[PDB]
Coordinates of C-alpha atoms and ligand atoms in Angstrom, one line a residue:
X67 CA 46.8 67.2 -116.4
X68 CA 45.5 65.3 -119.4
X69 CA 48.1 64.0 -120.9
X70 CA 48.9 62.1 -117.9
X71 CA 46.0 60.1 -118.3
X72 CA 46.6 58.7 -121.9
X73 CA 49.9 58.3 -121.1
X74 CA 49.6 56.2 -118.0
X75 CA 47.0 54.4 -119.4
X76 CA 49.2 53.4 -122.7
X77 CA 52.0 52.6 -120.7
X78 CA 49.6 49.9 -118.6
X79 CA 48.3 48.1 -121.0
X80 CA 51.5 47.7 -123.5
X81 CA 53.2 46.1 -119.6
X82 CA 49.5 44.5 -119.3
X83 CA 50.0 43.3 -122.8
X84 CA 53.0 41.8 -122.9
X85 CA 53.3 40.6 -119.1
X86 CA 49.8 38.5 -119.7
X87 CA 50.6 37.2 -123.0
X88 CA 54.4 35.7 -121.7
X89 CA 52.3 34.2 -119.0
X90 CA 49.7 33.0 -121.1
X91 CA 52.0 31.7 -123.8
X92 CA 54.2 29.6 -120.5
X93 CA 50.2 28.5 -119.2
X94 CA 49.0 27.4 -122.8
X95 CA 51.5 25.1 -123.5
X96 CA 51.8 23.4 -120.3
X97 CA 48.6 22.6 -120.6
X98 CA 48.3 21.7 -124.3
X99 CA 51.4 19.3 -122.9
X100 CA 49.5 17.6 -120.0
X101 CA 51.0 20.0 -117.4
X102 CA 48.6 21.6 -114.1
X103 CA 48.8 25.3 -113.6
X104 CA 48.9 26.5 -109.9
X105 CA 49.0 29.8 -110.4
X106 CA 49.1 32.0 -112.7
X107 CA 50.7 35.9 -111.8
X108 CA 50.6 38.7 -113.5
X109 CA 51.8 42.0 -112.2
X110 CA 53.3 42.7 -108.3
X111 CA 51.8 44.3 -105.6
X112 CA 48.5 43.2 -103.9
X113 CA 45.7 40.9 -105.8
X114 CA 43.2 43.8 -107.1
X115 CA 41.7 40.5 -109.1
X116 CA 41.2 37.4 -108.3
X117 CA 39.5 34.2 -109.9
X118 CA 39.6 30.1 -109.0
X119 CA 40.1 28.3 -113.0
X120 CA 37.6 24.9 -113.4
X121 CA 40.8 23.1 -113.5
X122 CA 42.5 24.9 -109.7
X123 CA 44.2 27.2 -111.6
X124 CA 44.0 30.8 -109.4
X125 CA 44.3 33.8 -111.8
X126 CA 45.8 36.9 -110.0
X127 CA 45.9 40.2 -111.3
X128 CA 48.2 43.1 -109.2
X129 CA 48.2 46.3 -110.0
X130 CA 51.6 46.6 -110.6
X131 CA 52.5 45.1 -114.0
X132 CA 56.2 44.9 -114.2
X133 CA 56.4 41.1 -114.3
X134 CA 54.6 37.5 -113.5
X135 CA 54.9 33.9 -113.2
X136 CA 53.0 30.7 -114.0
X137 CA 53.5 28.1 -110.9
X138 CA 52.8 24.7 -111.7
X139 CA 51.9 21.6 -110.1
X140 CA 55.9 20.5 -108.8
X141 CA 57.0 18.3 -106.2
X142 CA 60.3 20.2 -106.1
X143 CA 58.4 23.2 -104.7
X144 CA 55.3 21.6 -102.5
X145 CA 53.3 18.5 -101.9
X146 CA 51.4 16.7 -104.9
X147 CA 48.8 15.1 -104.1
X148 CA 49.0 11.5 -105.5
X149 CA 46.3 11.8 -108.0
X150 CA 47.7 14.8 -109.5
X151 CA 51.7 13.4 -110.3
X152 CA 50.8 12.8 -114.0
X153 CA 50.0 16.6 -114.4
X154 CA 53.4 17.5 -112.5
X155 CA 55.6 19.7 -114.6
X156 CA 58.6 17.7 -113.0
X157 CA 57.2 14.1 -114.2
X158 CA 57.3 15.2 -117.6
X159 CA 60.0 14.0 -120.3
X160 CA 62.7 16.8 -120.5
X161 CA 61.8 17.8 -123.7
X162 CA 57.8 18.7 -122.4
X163 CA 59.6 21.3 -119.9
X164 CA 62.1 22.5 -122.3
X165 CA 59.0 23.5 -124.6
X166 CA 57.3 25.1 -121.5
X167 CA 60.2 27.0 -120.6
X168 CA 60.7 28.0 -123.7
X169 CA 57.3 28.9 -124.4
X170 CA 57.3 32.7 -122.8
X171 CA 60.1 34.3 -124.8
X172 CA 58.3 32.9 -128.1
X173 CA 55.1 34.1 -127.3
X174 CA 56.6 37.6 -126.7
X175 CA 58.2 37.3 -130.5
X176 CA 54.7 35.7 -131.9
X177 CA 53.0 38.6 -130.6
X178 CA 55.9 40.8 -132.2
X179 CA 55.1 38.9 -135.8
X180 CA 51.2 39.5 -134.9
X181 CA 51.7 43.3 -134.5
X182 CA 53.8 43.5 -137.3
X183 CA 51.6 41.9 -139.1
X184 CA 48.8 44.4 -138.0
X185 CA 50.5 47.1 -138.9
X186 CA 51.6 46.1 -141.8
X187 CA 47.6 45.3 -143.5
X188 CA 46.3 49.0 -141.6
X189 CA 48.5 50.6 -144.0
X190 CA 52.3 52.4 -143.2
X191 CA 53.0 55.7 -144.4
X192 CA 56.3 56.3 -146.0
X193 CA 57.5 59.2 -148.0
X194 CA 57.5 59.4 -151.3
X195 CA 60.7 59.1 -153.9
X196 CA 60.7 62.5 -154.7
X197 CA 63.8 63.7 -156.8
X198 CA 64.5 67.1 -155.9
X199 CA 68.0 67.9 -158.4
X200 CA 70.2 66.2 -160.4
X201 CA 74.0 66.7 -160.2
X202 CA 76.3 67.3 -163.6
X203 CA 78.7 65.5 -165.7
X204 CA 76.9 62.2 -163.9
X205 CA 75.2 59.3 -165.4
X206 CA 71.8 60.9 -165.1
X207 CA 72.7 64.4 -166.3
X208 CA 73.4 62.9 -169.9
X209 CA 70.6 61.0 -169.2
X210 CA 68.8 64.3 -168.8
X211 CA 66.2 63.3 -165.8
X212 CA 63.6 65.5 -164.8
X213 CA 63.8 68.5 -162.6
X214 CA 61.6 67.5 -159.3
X215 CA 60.0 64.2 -160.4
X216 CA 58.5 61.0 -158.6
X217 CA 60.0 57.7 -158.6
X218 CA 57.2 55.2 -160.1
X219 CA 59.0 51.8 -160.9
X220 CA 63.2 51.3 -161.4
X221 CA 64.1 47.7 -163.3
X222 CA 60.3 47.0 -162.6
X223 CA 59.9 46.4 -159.5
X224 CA 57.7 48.6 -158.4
X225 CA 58.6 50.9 -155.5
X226 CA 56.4 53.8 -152.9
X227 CA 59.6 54.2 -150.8
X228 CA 63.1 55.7 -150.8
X229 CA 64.7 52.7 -148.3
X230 CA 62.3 50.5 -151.1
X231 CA 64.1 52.5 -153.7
X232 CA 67.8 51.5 -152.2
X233 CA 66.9 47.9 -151.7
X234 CA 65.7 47.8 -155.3
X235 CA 68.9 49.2 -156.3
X236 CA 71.0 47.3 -154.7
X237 CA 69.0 43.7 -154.9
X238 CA 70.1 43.4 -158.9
X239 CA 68.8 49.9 -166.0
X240 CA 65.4 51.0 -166.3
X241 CA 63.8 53.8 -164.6
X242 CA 60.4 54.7 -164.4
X243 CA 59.9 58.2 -163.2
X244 CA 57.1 60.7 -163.1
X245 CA 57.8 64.7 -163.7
X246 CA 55.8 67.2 -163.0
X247 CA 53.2 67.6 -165.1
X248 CA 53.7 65.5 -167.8
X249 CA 53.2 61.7 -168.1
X250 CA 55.6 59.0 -166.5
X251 CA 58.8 58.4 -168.3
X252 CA 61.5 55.6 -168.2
X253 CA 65.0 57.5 -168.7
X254 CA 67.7 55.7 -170.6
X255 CA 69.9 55.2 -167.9
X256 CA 75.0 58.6 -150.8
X257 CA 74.4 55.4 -153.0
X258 CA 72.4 57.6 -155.1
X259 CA 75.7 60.0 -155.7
X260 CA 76.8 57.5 -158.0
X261 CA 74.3 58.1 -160.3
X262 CA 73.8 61.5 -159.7
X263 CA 70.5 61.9 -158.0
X264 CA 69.6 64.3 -154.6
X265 CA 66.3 63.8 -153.0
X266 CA 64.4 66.2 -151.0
X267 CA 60.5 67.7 -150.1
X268 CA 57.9 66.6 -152.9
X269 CA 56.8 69.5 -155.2
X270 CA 54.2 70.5 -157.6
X271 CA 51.1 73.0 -158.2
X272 CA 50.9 76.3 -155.4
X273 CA 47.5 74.8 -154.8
X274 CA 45.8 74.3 -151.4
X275 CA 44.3 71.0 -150.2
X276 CA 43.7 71.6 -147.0
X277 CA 43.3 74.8 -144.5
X278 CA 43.2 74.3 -140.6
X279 CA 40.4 76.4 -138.9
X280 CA 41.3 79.6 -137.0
X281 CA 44.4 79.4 -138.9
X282 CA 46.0 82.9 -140.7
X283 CA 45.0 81.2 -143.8
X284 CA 41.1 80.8 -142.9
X285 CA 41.1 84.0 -141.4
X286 CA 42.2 85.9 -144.7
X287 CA 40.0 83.8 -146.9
X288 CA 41.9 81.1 -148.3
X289 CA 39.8 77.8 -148.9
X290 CA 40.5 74.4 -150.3
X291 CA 40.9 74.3 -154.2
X292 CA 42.3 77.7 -154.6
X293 CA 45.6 77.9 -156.6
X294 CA 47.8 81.1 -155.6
X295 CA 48.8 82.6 -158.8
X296 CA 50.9 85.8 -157.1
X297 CA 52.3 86.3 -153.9
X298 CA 53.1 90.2 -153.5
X299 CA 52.5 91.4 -157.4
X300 CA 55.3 88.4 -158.3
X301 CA 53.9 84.8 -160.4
X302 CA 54.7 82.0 -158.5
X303 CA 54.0 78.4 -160.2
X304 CA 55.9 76.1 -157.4
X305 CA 54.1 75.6 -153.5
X306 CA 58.1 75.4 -153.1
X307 CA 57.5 79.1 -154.1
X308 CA 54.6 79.9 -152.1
X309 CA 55.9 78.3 -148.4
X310 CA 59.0 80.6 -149.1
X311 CA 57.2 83.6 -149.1
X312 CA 55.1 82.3 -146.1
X313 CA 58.3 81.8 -144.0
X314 CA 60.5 84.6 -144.8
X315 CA 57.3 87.0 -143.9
X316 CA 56.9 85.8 -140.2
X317 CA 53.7 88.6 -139.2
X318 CA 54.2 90.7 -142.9
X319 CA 51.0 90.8 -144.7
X320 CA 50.9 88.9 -147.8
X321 CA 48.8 90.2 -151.0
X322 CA 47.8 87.0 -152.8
X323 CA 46.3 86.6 -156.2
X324 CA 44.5 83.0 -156.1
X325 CA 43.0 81.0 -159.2
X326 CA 39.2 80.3 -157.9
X327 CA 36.4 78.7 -159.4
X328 CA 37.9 79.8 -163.1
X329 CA 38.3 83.5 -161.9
X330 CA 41.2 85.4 -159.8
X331 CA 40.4 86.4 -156.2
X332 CA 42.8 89.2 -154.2
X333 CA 43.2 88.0 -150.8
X334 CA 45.3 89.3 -148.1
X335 CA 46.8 87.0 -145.1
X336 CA 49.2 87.8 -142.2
X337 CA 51.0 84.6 -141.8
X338 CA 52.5 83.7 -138.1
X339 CA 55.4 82.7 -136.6
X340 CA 55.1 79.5 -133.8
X341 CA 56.8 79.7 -130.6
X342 CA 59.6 77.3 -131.3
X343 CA 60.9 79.9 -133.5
X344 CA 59.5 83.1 -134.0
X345 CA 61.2 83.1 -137.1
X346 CA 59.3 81.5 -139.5
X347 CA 56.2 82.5 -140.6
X348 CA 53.2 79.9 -140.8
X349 CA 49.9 80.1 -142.2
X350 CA 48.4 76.9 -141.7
X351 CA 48.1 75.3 -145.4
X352 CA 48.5 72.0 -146.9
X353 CA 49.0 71.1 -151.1
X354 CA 46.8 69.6 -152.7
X355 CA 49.3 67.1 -153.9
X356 CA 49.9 64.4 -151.6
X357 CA 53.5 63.7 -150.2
X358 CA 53.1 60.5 -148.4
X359 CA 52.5 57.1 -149.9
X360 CA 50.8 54.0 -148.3
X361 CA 52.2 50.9 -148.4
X362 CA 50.2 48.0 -147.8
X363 CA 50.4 44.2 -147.6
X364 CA 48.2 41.3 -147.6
X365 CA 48.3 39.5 -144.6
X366 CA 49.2 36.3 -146.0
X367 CA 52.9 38.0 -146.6
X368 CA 52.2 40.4 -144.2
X369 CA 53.1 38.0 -141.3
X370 CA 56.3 37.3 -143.1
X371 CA 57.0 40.4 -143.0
X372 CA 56.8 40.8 -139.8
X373 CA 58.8 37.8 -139.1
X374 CA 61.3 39.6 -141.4
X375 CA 61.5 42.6 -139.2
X376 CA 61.7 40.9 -135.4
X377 CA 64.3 39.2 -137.0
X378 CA 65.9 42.6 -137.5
X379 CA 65.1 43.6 -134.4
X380 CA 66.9 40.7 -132.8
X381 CA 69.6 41.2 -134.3
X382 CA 70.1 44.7 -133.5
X383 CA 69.7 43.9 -130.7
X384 CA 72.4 41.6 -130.6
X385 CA 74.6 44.2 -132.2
X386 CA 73.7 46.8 -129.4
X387 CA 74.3 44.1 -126.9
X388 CA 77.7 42.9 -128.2
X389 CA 79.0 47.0 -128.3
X390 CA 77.6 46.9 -124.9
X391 CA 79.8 44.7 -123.2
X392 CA 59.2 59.4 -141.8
X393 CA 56.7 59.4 -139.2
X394 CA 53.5 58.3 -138.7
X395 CA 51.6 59.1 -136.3
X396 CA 48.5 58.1 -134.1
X397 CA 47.8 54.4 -132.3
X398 CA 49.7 53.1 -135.1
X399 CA 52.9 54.1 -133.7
X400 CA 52.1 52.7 -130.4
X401 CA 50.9 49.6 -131.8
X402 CA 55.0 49.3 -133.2
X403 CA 56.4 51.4 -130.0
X404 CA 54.4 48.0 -128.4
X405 CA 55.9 45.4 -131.1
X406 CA 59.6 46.7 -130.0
X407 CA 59.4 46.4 -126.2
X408 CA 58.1 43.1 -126.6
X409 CA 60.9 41.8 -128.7
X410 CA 63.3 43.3 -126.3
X411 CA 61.4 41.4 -123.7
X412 CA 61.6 38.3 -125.5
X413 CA 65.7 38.8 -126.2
X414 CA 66.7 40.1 -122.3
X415 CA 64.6 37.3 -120.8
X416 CA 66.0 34.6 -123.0
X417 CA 69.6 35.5 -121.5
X418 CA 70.8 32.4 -119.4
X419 CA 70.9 34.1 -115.9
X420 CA 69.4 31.6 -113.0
X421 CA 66.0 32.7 -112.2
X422 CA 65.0 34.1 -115.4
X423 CA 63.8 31.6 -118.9
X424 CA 67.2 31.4 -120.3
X425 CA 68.9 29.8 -117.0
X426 CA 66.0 27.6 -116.6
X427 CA 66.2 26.5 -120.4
X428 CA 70.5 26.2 -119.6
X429 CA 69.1 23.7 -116.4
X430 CA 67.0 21.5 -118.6
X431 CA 69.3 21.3 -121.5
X432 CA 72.3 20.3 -119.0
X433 CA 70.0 17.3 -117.4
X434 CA 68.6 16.4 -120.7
X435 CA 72.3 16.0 -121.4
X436 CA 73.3 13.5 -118.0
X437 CA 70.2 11.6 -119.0
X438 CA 70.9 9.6 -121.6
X439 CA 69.4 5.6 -120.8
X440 CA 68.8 5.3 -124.6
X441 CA 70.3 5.2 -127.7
X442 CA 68.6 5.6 -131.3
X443 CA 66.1 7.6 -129.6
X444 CA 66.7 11.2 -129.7
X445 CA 67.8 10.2 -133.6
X446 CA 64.3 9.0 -134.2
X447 CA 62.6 12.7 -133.2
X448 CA 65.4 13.7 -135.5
X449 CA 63.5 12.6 -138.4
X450 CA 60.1 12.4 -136.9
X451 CA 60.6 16.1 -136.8
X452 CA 62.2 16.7 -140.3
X453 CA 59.0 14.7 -141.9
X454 CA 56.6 17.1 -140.3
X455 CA 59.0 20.1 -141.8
X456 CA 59.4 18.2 -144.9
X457 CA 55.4 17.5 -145.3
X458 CA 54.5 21.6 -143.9
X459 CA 56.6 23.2 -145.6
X460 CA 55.6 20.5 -148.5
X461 CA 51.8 22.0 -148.1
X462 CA 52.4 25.3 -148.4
X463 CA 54.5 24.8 -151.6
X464 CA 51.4 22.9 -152.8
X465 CA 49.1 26.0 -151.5
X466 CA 51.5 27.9 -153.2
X467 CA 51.3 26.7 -156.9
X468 CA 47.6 26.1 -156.6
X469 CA 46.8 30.1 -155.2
X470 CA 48.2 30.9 -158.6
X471 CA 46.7 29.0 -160.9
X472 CA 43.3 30.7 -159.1
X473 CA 44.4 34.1 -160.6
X474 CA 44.9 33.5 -164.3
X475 CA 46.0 38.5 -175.2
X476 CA 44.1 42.0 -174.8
X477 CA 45.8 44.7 -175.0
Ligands
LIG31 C1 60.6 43.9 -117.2 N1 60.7 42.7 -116.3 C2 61.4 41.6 -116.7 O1 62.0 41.5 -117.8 C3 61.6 40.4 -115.7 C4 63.0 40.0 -115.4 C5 64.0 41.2 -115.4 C6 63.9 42.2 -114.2 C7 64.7 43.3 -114.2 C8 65.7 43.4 -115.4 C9 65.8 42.6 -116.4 C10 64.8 41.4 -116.4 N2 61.0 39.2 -116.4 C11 59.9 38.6 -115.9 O2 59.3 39.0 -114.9 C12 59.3 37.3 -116.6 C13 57.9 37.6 -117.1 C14 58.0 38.8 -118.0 C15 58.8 38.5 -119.2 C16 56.6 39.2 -118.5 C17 59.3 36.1 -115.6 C18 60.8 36.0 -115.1 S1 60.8 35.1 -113.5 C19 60.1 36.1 -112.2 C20 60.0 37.6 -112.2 C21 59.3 38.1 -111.0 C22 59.0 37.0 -110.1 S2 59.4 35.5 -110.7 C23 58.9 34.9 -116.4 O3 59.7 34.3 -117.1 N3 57.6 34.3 -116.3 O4 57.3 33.2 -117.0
LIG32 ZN1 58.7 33.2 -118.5

């Protein structure tokens, strides 16, 4: 048992993770605010860890990482000692502890964002716009588009996706699209039925880009940069072609006639079947051509981005909860596996029930609301607020218009 291991060990420190950055994002801002932390809890079970902060703040780790708690200094839950009332979470204006409360679902979304973001610079594979057929008397058969052919750029945005592709088409014709072969074109021109358009698996040259070791394909003598002319006598010109012949001969030899190094080499393979379906046959190939594109993002945009998509998130989340009552593998896909728990940690503790965030935020915003000695004040934050928005968001517009005067008739 392997597996086990990496498995466990994932699934502790995503909890770990997220568990000790709600904590830390509750701790931080209390004491940014002026606020004493007592405790501070991660995990249940017995303290594995244990360590006495500068300012008596006892960090406890448990092996059990399911959930956590920051205790504060509180008169409504021990003694304070008289020297220590002005760092009482309790003697604090109502907004201060609103903030605090508040302060562990947001930290759940930031780190969302953050992910997001990190994903989102490492580079995401998608597949590529690959148009496979076109349909008749549509807009794109007079048109006359291209038997397989890429999408390159449609009404000039330019586009490595097919979701892109949709959301190009349906943000508004011009189409710039690339053919086998020959160079990119732009055609005088589901959602796509309405044009007349089918996509499907990328095509091109029968030639080989990669070969697994102690594969069929090894074993009979194919190598990288060989380009199968025949399979069994018969020209083939399409690796569509080629992977046919390779599945519908599950444990059949295979005479091959490969392009090599300018001459022709006869090879003979005996392609296998797997054991999900002993149907098939499989040699163990790749094409040269590529089939996946990589979308990247600068960072700067890239933690909009991610904004963009919790946002999503959230509110799929709040579709799923209101009916209730490609792929890319590696760390990558843990990294977003970790993103998506943490959001739905952020959403589910946010709900007002008593002892969780939501029905401590529902506490403070019902005393904020008996409280009112003054009047005028809570309208003077009101624009003490908006000025802050009103100069940040003024910054950035500045930052804006000057990051594009830093870039700036050949032809
Ligand atoms: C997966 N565990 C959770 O989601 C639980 C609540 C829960 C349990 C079962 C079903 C649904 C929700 N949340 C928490 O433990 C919060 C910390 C998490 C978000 C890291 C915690 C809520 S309070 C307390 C929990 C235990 C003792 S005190 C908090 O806010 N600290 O600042
Ligand atoms: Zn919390």
């Amino acid at each position: 048992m392997t597996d086990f291991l990496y498995s466990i060990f994932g699934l502790l420190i995503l909890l770990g993770v997220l568990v000790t950055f709600h904590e830390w994002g509750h701790y931080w801002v209390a004491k940014k605010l002026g606020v004493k932390a007592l405790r501070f809890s991660v995990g249940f079970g017995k303290p594995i860890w244990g360590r006495t902060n500068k300012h008596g703040t006892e960090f406890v780790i448990a092996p059990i990482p399911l959930g956590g708690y920051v205790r504060f200094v509180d008169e409504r839950e021990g003694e304070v000692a008289e020297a220590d009332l002005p760092f009482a979470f309790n003697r604090q204006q109502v907004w201060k502890r609103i903030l605090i409360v508040l302060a562990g679902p947001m930290a759940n979304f930031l780190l969302a964002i953050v992910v997001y973001a990190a994903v989102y610079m490492m580079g995401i594979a998608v597949g590529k716009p690959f148009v496979t057929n076109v349909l008749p008397n549509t807009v794109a058969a007079q048109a006359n588009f291209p038997e397989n052919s890429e999408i390159l750029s449609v009404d000039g945005v330019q586009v490595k996706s097919l979701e892109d592709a949709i959301f190009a088409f349906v943000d508004h014709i011009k189409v710039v699209v690339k053919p086998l072969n020959q160079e990119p074109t732009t055609v005088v021109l589901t959602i796509f039925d309405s044009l007349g358009l089918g996509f499907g698996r990328v095509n091109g040259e029968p030639s080989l880009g990669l070969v697994a070791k102690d594969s069929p394909a090894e074993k009979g003598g194919l190598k990288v940069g060989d380009t199968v002319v025949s399979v069994n006598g018969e020209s083939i010109s399409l690796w569509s072609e080629f992977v046919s012949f390779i599945e519908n001969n599950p444990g059949k030899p295979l005479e091959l006639i490969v392009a090599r190094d300018g001459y022709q080499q006869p090879l003979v393979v005996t392609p296998e079947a797997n054991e999900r379906d002993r149907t098939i046959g499989y040699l163990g190939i790749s094409p040269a051509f590529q089939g996946y594109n990589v979308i990247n993002y600068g960072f700067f945009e890239s933690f909009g981005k991610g904004a963009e998509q919790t946002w999503v998130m959230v509110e799929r989340i709040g579709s799923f909860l209101g009916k209730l009552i490609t792929a890319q593998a590696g760390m990558v896909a843990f990294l977003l596996y970790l993103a998506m728990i943490s959001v739905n940690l952020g959403f589910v503790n946010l709900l007002p029930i008593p002892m969780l965030d939501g029905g401590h935020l529902m506490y403070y915003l019902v005393e904020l609301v008996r409280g009112k000695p003054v009047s005028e004040k809570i309208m003077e934050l009101g624009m003490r607020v908006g000025i802050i928005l009103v100069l940040t968001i003024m910054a950035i517009a500045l930052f804006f218009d000057i990051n594009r005067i830093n870039q700036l008739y050949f032809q």
